[PDB]
C-alpha cells in the first residue's frame, strides 16, 4: 500500500538561476549625432568667396 | 483461485485496477480496497485447499454418517 513519491521540476529552477546579472554597459566612443563639413561659401552677390 | 492469489499479492493501485477492468464499479472497488479486506483474503484462499484436500464422500464413505456420536465416543 505504498504511495509514489514526488517527481521534481529541473526545466523552471533552471530559469531562476540562469538568470545573470545585469550587464554593465561602458561607452568607447562619444555619442556623436553632429558632425563638421566643409561647404563653399559665397559673397552677397553670388560669387565663390 | 490461483489467479485471485495472484491479484492480491499485487500493488494496491493494482487492484483497483483489475477490479475496474472486469466491471465493477469505482466506489465499490475502492470500498474493497480501501477496507483492506484484501489483505484478509490471502488466509481465505489458503484455507480453501484444507477443506478441498480430504474426501468425506467416495464409492462408500457416502453411505456412513460421520457426525455420528459414536464415532465421536
Do not use: M, W
Amino acid at each position: 500500500k505504498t504511495i509514489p513519491t514526488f517527481e521534481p521540476k529541473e526545466s523552471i529552477l533552471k530559469k531562476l538561476e540562469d538568470i545573470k546579472p545585469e550587464q554593465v554597459k561602458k561607452q568607447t566612443k562619444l555619442f556623436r549625432i553632429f558632425e563638421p563639413r566643409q561647404l563653399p561659401v559665397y559673397r552677397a552677390n553670388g560669387e565663390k568667396e | 483461485i490461483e489467479e485471485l492469489y495472484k491479484v492480491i499479492s499485487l500493488h494496491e493501485n493494482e487492484i483497483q485496477l483489475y477490479l475496474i477492468s472486469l466491471g465493477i464499479p469505482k466506489i465499490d472497488a475502492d470500498t474493497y480496497v480501501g477496507s483492506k479486506i484484501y489483505s484478509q483474503d490471502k488466509y481465505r484462499i489458503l484455507e480453501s485447499y484444507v477443506y478441498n484436500l480430504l474426501s468425506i464422500n467416495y464409492g462408500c464413505y457416502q453411505l456412513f454418517d460421520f457426525n455420528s456420536p459414536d464415532l465421536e465416543k
